[PDB]
């Protein structure tokens, strides 16, 4: 009982201490995450069809992919929704407690069945599946003091040289790029193509 | 993750071109960072106030160094246990320690606060006192703890988007309370047998004690008015309790918000920017004493890219630099919207995302409106149009129904005649590509820039693709080499198509957001919608998704649970005093605490947010604890003594004053900050703080003269006939 | 072969995305747009299903076509819209009226 | 092939997309002159090897659309890096009948 | 899962074409529901004889 | 053990109430079926490539 330590202290004056260290250790490593997790996992395949267009994106890709979605454990709903900016995003909200890794996996087994049906231009485009919160973690501003480069030169930069890793890193579920990496751009002209009897083909 | 990115970035910095810097717009990390640390400061500092209260009452050094070093021991061990239980450090798991620091100062007080007397009984023996005080107290400590448990645990047993939020308090406190007992039977006993042991000053209490011991008993006598009083103070709550609205978690100023700016579909990138500037300017000029940065982004759709949407990560200053609610995200973002919606021909608007609410309380409802048969887009538009229409006729109750920007926009068809085409020797393929390369880009394949494989696209110079009449520039080598032009195997015609196609669960859908604003109940809105969602033409179904998925799902009745807690608070109590009757002596205190809380919470502008139950159970419970020790001393200073009737109650409520007054004042003055806090994380502080302080004072005195009645009212009215 | 299509194109998709619901084999088959070749009558016209397939493939297909008010615009620019191009045959008349 | 003709057509592009993958430490990569491309990725201490082979792997799955048809035919494979273990039986013929 | 299947099947009747019934042929769920009535009952019954 | 409880049966009786009250809930929200997970798990690959 208390008796023990009442007579013989320096044995409780250590428990306390050890106990105290236990909390010291356990603090150096306990996760200070924001607040507990409460948000049901969500994966969102999301293809894209260059200059395509809504009804086109979707009768031609989205219906395709969706039909193919089954055999997916804990799945509350999915909800395609995809723009005529030649573009799609389909997002599946799996239960709560569901192992993100596995859905993200799960989902991927299905969709891989449709890879072979998408139009080539959506394949080559890249098509992708993800496992992240929708709200933005943070934003990373990239400015140019000398004005020695422009908006378009920076979107490049950044791309060449910084997404890549971002994109790659445990934690960094999804990086959007607030611009675009460069590309040989062949702004044609018809009058010409016409003059010399050529076509974009 | 943020440590990494920022450190990844690092590796970069050394190498980028000249004058190229990483600024830092909207980042949510540091709030969280500062936040749960602005809480630590509390604990750290409130272990200070406790050290002083444990002085104006005990007047020694090393006799104070003992109870004040209990909570820091316990707490530390809570973090260990938290870790064992694969939990984390975060707001909930912290306030839980806060609201629990009471439960620690006290359990230490109680002990030394007791071996403090009995030192007024044995002249000068330390080990005798501490030990004697134990035994006639030890089994008492083990029981309170074995009972408070229940005042916590039966929450964090109803699960839900929530449920896990309470389970955090529950555990943190169910334990850290336990460690309080191990300290109690280990650290506090000894050590308080190791280092233990103004005529218009000290005399304050003592003179004023008897005057308390007097006022007591005599009460409820030649006027039974007091036993009535309860049924009054009780009927007190119940009222105010239904008047005080409930809420999950109080939105807070994170130091960052963003601004939508979705124009209507079909807008021009160049216009969208217009809108975006101005938004960028307004903030820049006007609220520049707050707005510290504005990362204006245009073409970025939150529900999909678009030439017609955009976003504005606005970033404030250090909070510290922004006193008074006028400089809070809520107000900053109030007028900020009034200013817009004005001079702005698009649906611009700003707002502060609700913290911890990854969908929990986003207020309102998603009502996906599916096409249950081979209907079509057009029909379905309409069927929404109706459902939408009615929505308007019932504004009787608070609503604001509406869709998400899938408004049909003009398309420009171009119908190719395969015959005229193969007629003129043209192939369809050659045309297709020409159409869909000049006007829809195309990526041939991959060049290499500066050792980084990158894309290559062929497309028309802007200037040869901006109005339908340009589709007259392109001609197309036929098989005879003769260059032929589209207007010779085709023909175009404007029409209406949709810039966005929803689908929900495989069937085509159309999301209709909306709310039941201040007034009616979130379950009426739905009811109503479901009601008028059953008119609309045959084929049309509906469904809920999101906050509304979770509404019809995850509300595991609290009283239904809190009852199972009564049963257990009793069976325990009885368990303890061996009496199917004595325990009502204590349960009866419940009201005397929540009475204060359900007030202040009404006095200050507050809700039934969590943080109110935590400070409602920390009192509801603690209260039932100081009451045990003042009903425990009877049945004892009675069953095991030469006393009885009131003689029991006598030294009981007499010896339960110094302790009470000490703890109660130990806790209260300790929660001081919380109540009126600076501004960073305040939301959560203020709410914890007003609920407790104004629920402590309300059940400290207003119970000190009140349990006694109970006890007597109790068993005396069980020996009647 | 009327109702099967129903349950397949009308209810097998959710059932099989329903909770607990493992795999979900279907005693029936969804509606194809079945086009039956006639030997002597194809022959009657100097045509192989090869030609048929050719037609089916260029007559009934969807085609991306870009947008007036393209991606990056000229300084000015007001009008911005999809240019809908060729497109898929939803009926069965057309499938019948394909030009061989 | 050769290193450019490979680092440009495959080491990259593939490695452009290793992005999503969980507990990744670092990813090195070799582009030699024989058309081989090895692109091993060591991962944090006790992460589940089975589950990192997945993603990695599963994430190639999206770059292939991009690999050239020469490569996608041979097939890029993915495995757990060990390249010296248990035993190694050997099978020779000591009467010059059978070649390598 | 049975309680979902039928629960969803309930959602997709309201829109069935003119006259379409959902017979429930082969289902091994009434058996379970019974071979639990039996045992559970023999329990009380156990309790009784003792 | 006895000699306590036998002297002091309420407590006792109390413990008996708790065990019952605590449990017995676990009958209103505890899974039900014929047999638990009895079969070992299997996985199937599925190829299928024209006549």
Short mmCIF file of N, CA, C and O in Angstrom, two decimals, chain B residues 534-637:
data_model
loop_
_atom_site.label_atom_id
_atom_site.label_comp_id
_atom_site.label_asym_id
_atom_site.label_seq_id
_atom_site.Cartn_x
_atom_site.Cartn_y
_atom_site.Cartn_z
N UNK B 534 -40.13 13.91 -54.94
CA UNK B 534 -40.98 12.79 -55.31
C UNK B 534 -42.09 13.20 -56.31
O UNK B 534 -42.86 12.34 -56.76
N UNK B 535 -42.18 14.50 -56.64
CA UNK B 535 -43.02 15.05 -57.74
C UNK B 535 -42.35 14.72 -59.06
O UNK B 535 -42.68 13.74 -59.71
N UNK B 536 -41.43 15.61 -59.44
CA UNK B 536 -40.61 15.53 -60.64
C UNK B 536 -40.84 14.29 -61.42
O UNK B 536 -40.92 13.23 -60.86
N UNK B 537 -40.93 14.44 -62.73
CA UNK B 537 -41.29 13.46 -63.74
C UNK B 537 -40.72 12.08 -63.50
O UNK B 537 -39.67 11.93 -62.86
N UNK B 538 -41.39 11.08 -64.05
CA UNK B 538 -41.04 9.69 -63.80
C UNK B 538 -39.67 9.44 -64.35
O UNK B 538 -39.35 9.95 -65.42
N UNK B 539 -38.86 8.68 -63.63
CA UNK B 539 -37.46 8.52 -64.00
C UNK B 539 -36.49 9.21 -63.04
O UNK B 539 -35.30 8.87 -63.00
N UNK B 540 -36.98 10.20 -62.27
CA UNK B 540 -36.06 10.97 -61.50
C UNK B 540 -35.95 10.52 -60.03
O UNK B 540 -36.94 10.39 -59.32
N UNK B 541 -34.73 10.25 -59.59
CA UNK B 541 -34.49 9.71 -58.25
C UNK B 541 -33.72 10.75 -57.48
O UNK B 541 -33.66 11.94 -57.88
N UNK B 542 -33.10 10.37 -56.37
CA UNK B 542 -32.25 11.32 -55.71
C UNK B 542 -31.36 10.60 -54.73
O UNK B 542 -31.46 9.36 -54.61
N UNK B 543 -30.51 11.36 -54.03
CA UNK B 543 -29.67 10.77 -53.02
C UNK B 543 -28.79 11.80 -52.35
O UNK B 543 -28.58 12.90 -52.90
N UNK B 544 -28.27 11.42 -51.18
CA UNK B 544 -27.50 12.25 -50.30
C UNK B 544 -26.00 11.85 -50.39
O UNK B 544 -25.70 10.71 -50.64
N UNK B 545 -25.05 12.78 -50.21
CA UNK B 545 -23.63 12.42 -50.36
C UNK B 545 -22.74 13.39 -49.66
O UNK B 545 -22.49 14.48 -50.16
N UNK B 546 -22.21 13.03 -48.53
CA UNK B 546 -21.32 13.97 -47.90
C UNK B 546 -21.93 14.23 -46.58
O UNK B 546 -22.34 13.28 -45.91
N UNK B 547 -22.00 15.50 -46.20
CA UNK B 547 -22.51 15.87 -44.87
C UNK B 547 -23.87 15.18 -44.62
O UNK B 547 -24.15 14.67 -43.52
N UNK B 548 -24.65 15.08 -45.69
CA UNK B 548 -25.94 14.40 -45.62
C UNK B 548 -25.83 12.83 -45.65
O UNK B 548 -26.72 12.10 -45.20
N UNK B 549 -24.75 12.29 -46.18
CA UNK B 549 -24.62 10.88 -46.04
C UNK B 549 -24.61 10.70 -44.56
O UNK B 549 -25.50 10.09 -44.00
N UNK B 550 -23.64 11.35 -43.93
CA UNK B 550 -23.41 11.31 -42.47
C UNK B 550 -24.53 11.79 -41.48
O UNK B 550 -24.45 11.53 -40.28
N UNK B 551 -25.57 12.48 -41.99
CA UNK B 551 -26.71 12.96 -41.18
C UNK B 551 -27.67 11.87 -40.85
O UNK B 551 -27.91 11.61 -39.70
N UNK B 552 -28.23 11.23 -41.88
CA UNK B 552 -29.00 10.00 -41.68
C UNK B 552 -28.19 8.82 -41.10
O UNK B 552 -28.73 7.73 -40.87
N UNK B 553 -26.91 9.08 -40.84
CA UNK B 553 -25.95 8.05 -40.39
C UNK B 553 -24.84 8.61 -39.48
O UNK B 553 -23.87 9.24 -39.99
N UNK B 554 -24.95 8.32 -38.17
CA UNK B 554 -23.97 8.76 -37.13
C UNK B 554 -24.59 9.85 -36.21
O UNK B 554 -24.30 11.06 -36.34
N UNK B 555 -25.46 9.40 -35.30
CA UNK B 555 -26.06 10.25 -34.26
C UNK B 555 -26.36 9.49 -32.95
O UNK B 555 -27.22 9.95 -32.15
N UNK B 556 -25.63 8.36 -32.74
CA UNK B 556 -25.82 7.37 -31.64
C UNK B 556 -26.19 7.98 -30.28
O UNK B 556 -25.34 8.09 -29.40
N UNK B 557 -27.48 8.33 -30.16
CA UNK B 557 -28.08 9.05 -29.02
C UNK B 557 -27.16 9.22 -27.81
O UNK B 557 -26.64 8.23 -27.27
N UNK B 558 -26.96 10.46 -27.36
CA UNK B 558 -26.20 10.68 -26.12
C UNK B 558 -26.99 10.28 -24.85
O UNK B 558 -26.50 9.47 -24.05
N UNK B 559 -28.23 10.80 -24.66
CA UNK B 559 -28.89 10.43 -23.40
C UNK B 559 -28.97 8.91 -23.36
O UNK B 559 -28.66 8.29 -22.36
N UNK B 560 -29.33 8.32 -24.48
CA UNK B 560 -29.35 6.88 -24.53
C UNK B 560 -28.05 6.32 -23.97
O UNK B 560 -28.05 5.28 -23.36
N UNK B 561 -26.95 7.01 -24.19
CA UNK B 561 -25.72 6.52 -23.62
C UNK B 561 -25.62 7.06 -22.19
O UNK B 561 -25.59 6.24 -21.26
N UNK B 562 -25.62 8.39 -22.00
CA UNK B 562 -25.47 9.03 -20.66
C UNK B 562 -26.32 8.41 -19.53
O UNK B 562 -25.91 8.50 -18.35
N UNK B 563 -27.47 7.80 -19.88
CA UNK B 563 -28.25 6.91 -18.96
C UNK B 563 -27.46 5.70 -18.46
O UNK B 563 -27.34 5.47 -17.25
N UNK B 564 -26.93 4.92 -19.39
CA UNK B 564 -26.15 3.76 -19.04
C UNK B 564 -25.04 4.27 -18.11
O UNK B 564 -24.45 3.52 -17.33
N UNK B 565 -24.78 5.56 -18.16
CA UNK B 565 -23.79 6.14 -17.24
C UNK B 565 -24.36 6.38 -15.84
O UNK B 565 -23.69 6.07 -14.85
N UNK B 566 -25.56 6.94 -15.77
CA UNK B 566 -26.29 6.99 -14.51
C UNK B 566 -26.28 5.62 -13.83
O UNK B 566 -25.64 5.43 -12.80
N UNK B 567 -26.96 4.66 -14.44
CA UNK B 567 -26.95 3.29 -13.88
C UNK B 567 -25.56 2.91 -13.27
O UNK B 567 -25.49 2.39 -12.15
N UNK B 568 -24.47 3.22 -13.98
CA UNK B 568 -23.13 2.84 -13.53
C UNK B 568 -22.54 3.80 -12.48
O UNK B 568 -21.68 3.42 -11.66
N UNK B 569 -23.00 5.04 -12.50
CA UNK B 569 -22.55 6.02 -11.48
C UNK B 569 -23.19 5.61 -10.16
O UNK B 569 -22.67 5.90 -9.08
N UNK B 570 -24.32 4.92 -10.25
CA UNK B 570 -25.06 4.59 -9.07
C UNK B 570 -24.49 3.27 -8.57
O UNK B 570 -23.83 3.24 -7.54
N UNK B 571 -24.66 2.20 -9.35
CA UNK B 571 -24.21 0.89 -8.96
C UNK B 571 -22.81 0.95 -8.37
O UNK B 571 -22.47 0.15 -7.48
N UNK B 572 -21.99 1.87 -8.89
CA UNK B 572 -20.66 2.10 -8.33
C UNK B 572 -20.78 2.67 -6.93
O UNK B 572 -20.27 2.08 -5.98
N UNK B 573 -21.47 3.83 -6.84
CA UNK B 573 -21.66 4.58 -5.62
C UNK B 573 -22.13 3.64 -4.53
O UNK B 573 -21.40 3.43 -3.53
N UNK B 574 -23.32 3.06 -4.75
CA UNK B 574 -23.91 2.05 -3.86
C UNK B 574 -22.82 1.09 -3.54
O UNK B 574 -22.42 0.96 -2.38
N UNK B 575 -22.31 0.46 -4.60
CA UNK B 575 -21.14 -0.41 -4.49
C UNK B 575 -20.22 -0.02 -3.35
O UNK B 575 -19.89 -0.86 -2.50
N UNK B 576 -19.84 1.27 -3.35
CA UNK B 576 -18.94 1.93 -2.39
C UNK B 576 -19.50 2.03 -0.95
O UNK B 576 -18.96 1.36 -0.06
N UNK B 577 -20.55 2.83 -0.73
CA UNK B 577 -21.26 2.91 0.58
C UNK B 577 -22.18 1.70 0.99
O UNK B 577 -22.92 1.76 2.00
N UNK B 578 -22.19 0.64 0.20
CA UNK B 578 -23.00 -0.52 0.50
C UNK B 578 -24.52 -0.23 0.62
O UNK B 578 -25.32 -1.10 1.00
N UNK B 579 -24.91 0.97 0.20
CA UNK B 579 -26.30 1.40 0.36
C UNK B 579 -27.12 1.67 -0.91
O UNK B 579 -26.91 2.69 -1.59
N UNK B 580 -28.11 0.83 -1.19
CA UNK B 580 -29.05 1.15 -2.25
C UNK B 580 -29.73 2.49 -2.06
O UNK B 580 -30.76 2.73 -2.68
N UNK B 581 -29.18 3.34 -1.21
CA UNK B 581 -29.82 4.60 -0.87
C UNK B 581 -28.83 5.75 -0.67
O UNK B 581 -29.00 6.80 -1.29
N UNK B 582 -27.81 5.58 0.17
CA UNK B 582 -26.81 6.67 0.44
C UNK B 582 -26.37 7.46 -0.83
O UNK B 582 -26.43 8.70 -0.82
N UNK B 583 -25.99 6.76 -1.96
CA UNK B 583 -25.42 7.40 -3.17
C UNK B 583 -26.19 8.62 -3.73
O UNK B 583 -25.57 9.49 -4.34
N UNK B 584 -27.51 8.67 -3.55
CA UNK B 584 -28.30 9.79 -4.07
C UNK B 584 -27.86 11.04 -3.37
O UNK B 584 -28.10 12.14 -3.86
N UNK B 585 -27.21 10.88 -2.22
CA UNK B 585 -26.57 12.02 -1.53
C UNK B 585 -25.70 12.84 -2.47
O UNK B 585 -25.65 14.08 -2.32
N UNK B 586 -25.02 12.15 -3.41
CA UNK B 586 -24.00 12.74 -4.32
C UNK B 586 -24.51 12.97 -5.73
O UNK B 586 -24.41 14.09 -6.25
N UNK B 587 -25.09 11.94 -6.35
CA UNK B 587 -25.63 12.11 -7.71
C UNK B 587 -26.34 13.46 -7.85
O UNK B 587 -26.21 14.15 -8.87
N UNK B 588 -27.02 13.84 -6.77
CA UNK B 588 -27.88 15.02 -6.71
C UNK B 588 -27.12 16.29 -6.98
O UNK B 588 -27.73 17.32 -7.31
N UNK B 589 -25.80 16.24 -6.84
CA UNK B 589 -24.99 17.43 -7.10
C UNK B 589 -24.93 17.75 -8.60
O UNK B 589 -24.86 18.93 -8.95
N UNK B 590 -24.98 16.72 -9.46
CA UNK B 590 -24.91 16.85 -10.94
C UNK B 590 -25.35 18.24 -11.39
O UNK B 590 -24.58 18.93 -12.05
N UNK B 591 -26.59 18.64 -11.02
CA UNK B 591 -27.24 19.87 -11.45
C UNK B 591 -26.56 21.14 -11.03
O UNK B 591 -26.51 22.07 -11.82
N UNK B 592 -26.04 21.17 -9.80
CA UNK B 592 -25.40 22.34 -9.21
C UNK B 592 -24.20 22.88 -10.00
O UNK B 592 -23.83 24.06 -9.86
N UNK B 593 -23.63 22.02 -10.86
CA UNK B 593 -22.50 22.36 -11.76
C UNK B 593 -22.90 22.78 -13.17
O UNK B 593 -22.46 23.83 -13.69
N UNK B 594 -23.75 21.95 -13.78
CA UNK B 594 -24.19 22.19 -15.14
C UNK B 594 -25.00 23.44 -15.15
O UNK B 594 -25.22 24.00 -16.22
N UNK B 595 -25.47 23.84 -13.96
CA UNK B 595 -26.25 25.08 -13.76
C UNK B 595 -25.41 26.26 -14.10
O UNK B 595 -25.88 27.16 -14.76
N UNK B 596 -24.17 26.25 -13.65
CA UNK B 596 -23.25 27.34 -13.95
C UNK B 596 -22.93 27.30 -15.41
O UNK B 596 -23.21 28.27 -16.11
N UNK B 597 -22.38 26.18 -15.88
CA UNK B 597 -22.09 25.97 -17.31
C UNK B 597 -23.22 26.39 -18.30
O UNK B 597 -23.02 27.25 -19.17
N UNK B 598 -24.40 25.81 -18.16
CA UNK B 598 -25.51 26.16 -19.04
C UNK B 598 -25.77 27.61 -18.95
O UNK B 598 -26.71 28.10 -19.57
N UNK B 599 -24.98 28.27 -18.10
CA UNK B 599 -24.93 29.73 -17.94
C UNK B 599 -23.48 30.11 -18.17
O UNK B 599 -22.59 29.27 -18.07
N UNK B 600 -23.22 31.38 -18.47
CA UNK B 600 -21.89 31.81 -18.96
C UNK B 600 -21.78 31.44 -20.42
O UNK B 600 -21.62 32.31 -21.27
N UNK B 601 -21.90 30.15 -20.70
CA UNK B 601 -22.18 29.66 -22.04
C UNK B 601 -23.34 30.39 -22.71
O UNK B 601 -23.34 30.58 -23.94
N UNK B 602 -24.34 30.77 -21.92
CA UNK B 602 -25.41 31.66 -22.40
C UNK B 602 -25.07 33.15 -22.24
O UNK B 602 -25.53 34.01 -23.02
N UNK B 603 -24.28 33.44 -21.21
CA UNK B 603 -23.91 34.81 -20.89
C UNK B 603 -22.93 35.28 -21.96
O UNK B 603 -23.19 36.25 -22.67
N UNK B 604 -21.81 34.56 -22.09
CA UNK B 604 -20.89 34.74 -23.21
C UNK B 604 -21.57 34.21 -24.48
O UNK B 604 -22.58 33.48 -24.41
N UNK B 605 -21.08 34.61 -25.64
CA UNK B 605 -21.71 34.16 -26.87
C UNK B 605 -21.14 32.80 -27.19
O UNK B 605 -20.13 32.73 -27.90
N UNK B 606 -21.76 31.74 -26.64
CA UNK B 606 -21.22 30.38 -26.79
C UNK B 606 -22.24 29.32 -27.22
O UNK B 606 -23.46 29.59 -27.29
N UNK B 607 -21.73 28.13 -27.51
CA UNK B 607 -22.60 27.03 -27.90
C UNK B 607 -22.41 25.81 -27.03
O UNK B 607 -21.61 25.82 -26.07
N UNK B 608 -23.12 24.75 -27.41
CA UNK B 608 -22.93 23.42 -26.83
C UNK B 608 -21.78 22.64 -27.51
O UNK B 608 -21.82 21.40 -27.54
N UNK B 609 -20.78 23.34 -28.07
CA UNK B 609 -19.67 22.71 -28.79
C UNK B 609 -19.11 21.64 -27.89
O UNK B 609 -19.50 21.58 -26.74
N UNK B 610 -18.22 20.77 -28.39
CA UNK B 610 -17.49 19.85 -27.49
C UNK B 610 -16.84 20.83 -26.56
O UNK B 610 -17.29 21.96 -26.50
N UNK B 611 -15.81 20.49 -25.83
CA UNK B 611 -15.17 21.55 -25.02
C UNK B 611 -16.16 22.13 -23.97
O UNK B 611 -15.76 22.83 -23.04
N UNK B 612 -17.45 21.86 -24.16
CA UNK B 612 -18.47 22.22 -23.21
C UNK B 612 -18.86 20.97 -22.45
O UNK B 612 -19.16 21.05 -21.27
N UNK B 613 -18.83 19.81 -23.13
CA UNK B 613 -19.12 18.54 -22.46
C UNK B 613 -17.92 18.14 -21.66
O UNK B 613 -18.05 17.53 -20.61
N UNK B 614 -16.75 18.48 -22.19
CA UNK B 614 -15.54 18.09 -21.49
C UNK B 614 -15.48 18.85 -20.19
O UNK B 614 -15.16 18.27 -19.16
N UNK B 615 -15.84 20.14 -20.23
CA UNK B 615 -15.85 21.00 -19.02
C UNK B 615 -17.15 20.83 -18.23
O UNK B 615 -17.34 21.41 -17.13
N UNK B 616 -18.07 20.06 -18.83
CA UNK B 616 -19.35 19.78 -18.24
C UNK B 616 -19.21 18.47 -17.47
O UNK B 616 -19.90 18.28 -16.48
N UNK B 617 -18.31 17.60 -17.90
CA UNK B 617 -18.12 16.31 -17.23
C UNK B 617 -17.03 16.38 -16.19
O UNK B 617 -17.05 15.65 -15.18
N UNK B 618 -16.05 17.25 -16.47
CA UNK B 618 -15.00 17.56 -15.53
C UNK B 618 -15.61 18.23 -14.30
O UNK B 618 -15.10 18.08 -13.19
N UNK B 619 -16.70 18.96 -14.46
CA UNK B 619 -17.39 19.46 -13.28
C UNK B 619 -18.41 18.45 -12.82
O UNK B 619 -18.21 17.85 -11.77
N UNK B 620 -19.46 18.20 -13.60
CA UNK B 620 -20.40 17.11 -13.29
C UNK B 620 -19.76 16.00 -12.49
O UNK B 620 -20.39 15.42 -11.60
N UNK B 621 -18.52 15.67 -12.85
CA UNK B 621 -17.80 14.61 -12.18
C UNK B 621 -17.04 15.04 -10.95
O UNK B 621 -17.28 14.55 -9.86
N UNK B 622 -16.09 15.94 -11.14
CA UNK B 622 -15.34 16.46 -10.04
C UNK B 622 -16.32 16.80 -8.96
O UNK B 622 -16.18 16.34 -7.84
N UNK B 623 -17.34 17.59 -9.28
CA UNK B 623 -18.38 17.91 -8.32
C UNK B 623 -18.86 16.68 -7.52
O UNK B 623 -18.92 16.70 -6.30
N UNK B 624 -19.22 15.62 -8.21
CA UNK B 624 -19.65 14.40 -7.55
C UNK B 624 -18.52 13.78 -6.74
O UNK B 624 -18.74 12.75 -6.12
N UNK B 625 -17.34 14.39 -6.77
CA UNK B 625 -16.16 13.83 -6.11
C UNK B 625 -15.97 14.48 -4.77
O UNK B 625 -15.86 13.79 -3.76
N UNK B 626 -15.93 15.81 -4.75
CA UNK B 626 -15.85 16.53 -3.49
C UNK B 626 -17.07 16.18 -2.62
O UNK B 626 -17.00 16.28 -1.38
N UNK B 627 -18.13 15.71 -3.29
CA UNK B 627 -19.36 15.28 -2.63
C UNK B 627 -19.23 13.89 -2.05
O UNK B 627 -19.99 13.48 -1.17
N UNK B 628 -18.29 13.12 -2.56
CA UNK B 628 -18.19 11.78 -2.04
C UNK B 628 -17.55 11.96 -0.69
O UNK B 628 -18.05 11.46 0.31
N UNK B 629 -16.48 12.75 -0.68
CA UNK B 629 -15.69 12.94 0.49
C UNK B 629 -16.46 13.70 1.55
O UNK B 629 -16.06 13.73 2.72
N UNK B 630 -17.58 14.28 1.14
CA UNK B 630 -18.48 14.95 2.07
C UNK B 630 -19.79 14.16 2.10
O UNK B 630 -20.84 14.70 1.85
N UNK B 631 -19.70 12.86 2.36
CA UNK B 631 -20.86 11.97 2.50
C UNK B 631 -20.22 10.67 2.82
O UNK B 631 -20.88 9.65 3.09
N UNK B 632 -18.90 10.70 2.71
CA UNK B 632 -18.09 9.57 3.00
C UNK B 632 -17.71 9.76 4.44
O UNK B 632 -17.80 8.80 5.22
N UNK B 633 -17.30 10.99 4.79
CA UNK B 633 -16.94 11.31 6.18
C UNK B 633 -18.11 11.02 7.14
O UNK B 633 -17.87 10.54 8.26
N UNK B 634 -19.36 11.30 6.71
CA UNK B 634 -20.53 10.73 7.38
C UNK B 634 -20.59 9.22 7.08
O UNK B 634 -19.69 8.68 6.47
N UNK B 635 -21.64 8.53 7.51
CA UNK B 635 -21.68 7.06 7.43
C UNK B 635 -20.45 6.44 8.07
O UNK B 635 -20.27 5.21 8.08
N UNK B 636 -19.61 7.31 8.62
CA UNK B 636 -18.29 6.94 9.10
C UNK B 636 -18.10 7.71 10.40
O UNK B 636 -18.05 7.13 11.50
N UNK B 637 -18.02 9.03 10.27
CA UNK B 637 -18.02 9.94 11.43
C UNK B 637 -19.40 9.74 12.03
O UNK B 637 -19.98 10.65 12.62
#
